Structures are given as C-alpha cells and as structure tokens.
Design a protein around this ligand. Structure first.
Ligand SMILES: CN(C)c1ccc(C(=O)NCCCCCCC(=O)NO)cc1
Ligand SMILES: [K+]
Ligand SMILES: [K+]
Ligand SMILES: [Mn+2]
Length: 355
C-alpha cells in the first residue's frame, strides 16, 4: 500500500517555530507538494504526544521541568528553554509515534516524518537542540509488533541518544555513520563503541572524516548494512536521514549529495520491511528540502524533474533553480586504509550477533 506522509497545517506551523531551523518544515513540505508527490502518498494528521506517551522513555521529572520552563536537565547553550518548547516537543514526539502506529496496523510499509529525528535527547536531559527523543518513542511503539528493530542514523552527528536508550538490549540494534573528530559533538561513537551488557555488539558505529562523498559513503554503508541484515535479521527499520551531510551545509563537514544518500535508502527499502523515515539536522534550508524531496521521490520510485517548480519558496533556490546539488571541492580526508580498518572491526563485532 502507499507510503504514509505525516502532515497537517498545524504541525508544520509548530515545527516552523524551531529556532535553529526556522521555516524549514514549510520549505520541505511545499517542495514535496510542488513536485506533486503528496498526491501519491497517504496524508495522516499526527497526534500530539501525551505526558504518559513521552514518559515511556523520558523521566517524569524531566518532562515536568520541560513543561514548566516552557510555561514562562541539559537546557543550556544548545538547548535553551524558550517559550512553548514543551508543545513543539510533544508535537514531534506525537508525529513519530503516529508514524509508528501506522506501521503497526499495516496501514503502510513506509511512514514519513521529515520533522522528526531528534536523536541526541536522553531520558532525563535535552542535548544538541533535541528536547525529546522522538526516534526512541517510535522504536518503543514499533516494539509492540516487531521483535527486532534496526535503527540506522545517517545524520552527520552520532545518534547517541538512541544508542544510549538501547545500549543494554539486543532487541534493538543501532547503526550510526557520523563524523568522529576531536572536538566534534557529541564526541561519542568510535568504532570501538559496541554497546554494553546484554547489548554488547548490538550498537555499530562508523567514525568518518571530513570530505566524504557519495561513492565511498555508499560503499561503507552497503558493506555495513549487508552484514547487519545477515546477522541481526531485523523485522522493522527506523531510518534517520539528517541532511547536514549534504554539500553546502554550514556544518561544512561531509561532501555528500542526495543521490548517495538515496542509494543507502534504496538498499534499505529493498528489504521490504516496515520502515519509519525521519529527518534530523540540515542547516542549508533549501538544500535540506532538495534532499528530502529527492528522497521522497526515491521512496515512491519516481524520477523528479531537475527544474525546481514555482512555489512559495522558489526564490530560495536561486541563482540556478535546480534540484541537484554539486559536491564542493573540499578534500576527502578519508584514507582508504583507515576505512578498511573500520569495516574490518565491524565485520568482526557482528560475528557475535547470532539470533
Ligand atoms: C566557540 N563556542 C563558544 C562554541 C564552540 C562549539 C559549539 C558546538 O559545536 N556545539 C554543538 C552544536 C550541536 C550540534 C548537534 C546538532 C545536529 O545537527 N545534530 O544532529 C558551540 C559553541
Ligand atoms: K549518524
Ligand atoms: K542495542
Ligand atoms: Mn546533525
């Protein structure tokens, strides 16, 4: 059946308020609409997460504080307590939950929430602009139906909050590809990070250096997810597709285009598992929309016109007004020997995973 697209006017207005990515949610949706892709999906209005829904992961003390400061726990430079942040958080939490529920009822095989992917938040602390971990909330919901969940995080940053939540269990494997460099947030996720306790070997991390491009990135991601699929035999997938890897992002780290990320998405989609799709970082707002629109076409098996259609944010796509993103000339700092070393470490780790 058709992919579920989580959307409502009210939800977009709320997400548009997020101080770090103002109007991004509108840019993404309206570009998707301009390409007419919403006509090929099923539109589902997200529900707002309740206190008890949020507490399936977050502590009651954290949530009540979140609510309080919202009225007027890690809430500093990166997570300042501004007005209404509790409600924005509940909205995005509720949207990802709703996408998880759609997948449970076999309503669809793919459900999309581009405004989710808040991977840094911990049970009792905001972190890295994330005030609530919607991905954790969605994974926990999927656990009602699906015995083993694979979480793949292709954001520029290590998916630490989701990894930490599931660090001690073998029911959820987390796989993050990310920049790993001294001084680079959040600082965790070296290849030696494999989880803890009964969850040992059920976290995978691929530390990557600046300048990686589509070919090498896909080679890495394919080699890893092939071994992971073979060992772990997931029954459902949650996929975080933060677009702060894309050439032209203020993070100025990776040198990806949406085509490379699309090949990673295609590879996952061929498994034909229930797959919950999330956004994440993405700070060149027009490139982020270009990326997730392209990825939405990949999901629908549609090839999109190169020319950006006229729509509300048309002027954001000047001077060239095309959907494709050109790589920068920044050096690729990934030595082939080091990448091979990393992949061999992971190959080894995954031999312990036996279902
Ligand atoms: C000089 N100075 C005072 C500072 C230096 C570095 C940071 C920083 O990197 N902070 C981390 C920003 C959060 C990054 C995570 C966002 C994301 O895209 N996650 O996926 C801040 C201030
Ligand atoms: K990541
Ligand atoms: K785990
Ligand atoms: Mn990021």
């Amino acid at each position: 059946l058709v992919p579920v697209y989580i959307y409502s006017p009210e939800y977009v207005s709320m997400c548009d308020s997020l101080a770090k990515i103002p109007k991004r949610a509108s840019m993404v949706h309206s570009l998707i609409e301009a390409y007419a892709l919403h006509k090929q999906m099923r539109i589902v209005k997200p529900k707002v997460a309740s206190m008890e829904e949020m507490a399936t992961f977050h502590t009651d003390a954290y949530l009540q504080h979140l609510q309080k400061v919202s009225q007027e726990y890690g809430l500093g430079y990166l997570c300042p307590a501004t007005e209404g942040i509790f409600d924005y958080a509940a909205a995005i939490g509720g949207a990802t939950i709703t996408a998880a529920q759609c997948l449970i009822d076999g309503m669809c095989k793919v459900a999309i929430n581009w405004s989710g992917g808040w991977h840094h938040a911990k049970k009792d602390e905001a972190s890295g602009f994330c005030y609530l971990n919607d991905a954790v909330l969605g994974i926990l919901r999927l656990r009602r139906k699906f015995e083993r969940i694979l979480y793949v995080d292709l954001d520029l940053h290590h998916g630490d909050g989701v990894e930490d939540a599931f660090s001690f269990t073998s029911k959820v494997m987390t796989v993050s590809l990310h920049k790993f460099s001294p001084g680079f947030f959040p600082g965790t996720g070296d290849v030696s990070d494999v989880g803890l306790g009964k969850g040992r070997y059920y976290s995978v991390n691929v530390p990557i250096q600046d300048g990686i491009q589509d070919e090498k990135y896909y080679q890495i991601c394919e080699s890893v997810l092939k071994e992971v699929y073979q060992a772990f035999n997931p029954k459902a997938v949650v996929l975080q597709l933060g677009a702060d890897t894309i050439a032209g992002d203020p993070m100025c780290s990776f040198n990806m285009t949406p085509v490379g990320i699309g090949k990673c998405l295609k590879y996952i989609l061929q498994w034909q598992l229930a797959t919950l799709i999330l956004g994440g970082g993405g700070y060149n707002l027009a490139n982020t929309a270009r990326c997730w629109t392209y990825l939405t076409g990949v999901i629908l098996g549609k090839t999109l016109s190169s020319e950006i259609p006229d729509h509300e944010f048309f002027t954001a796509y000047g001077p060239d007004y095309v959907l494709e993103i050109t790589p920068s000339c920044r050096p690729d700092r990934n030595e082939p020997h080091r990448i091979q070393q990393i992949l061999n470490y992971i190959k080894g780790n995954l031999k312990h995973v036996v279902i």
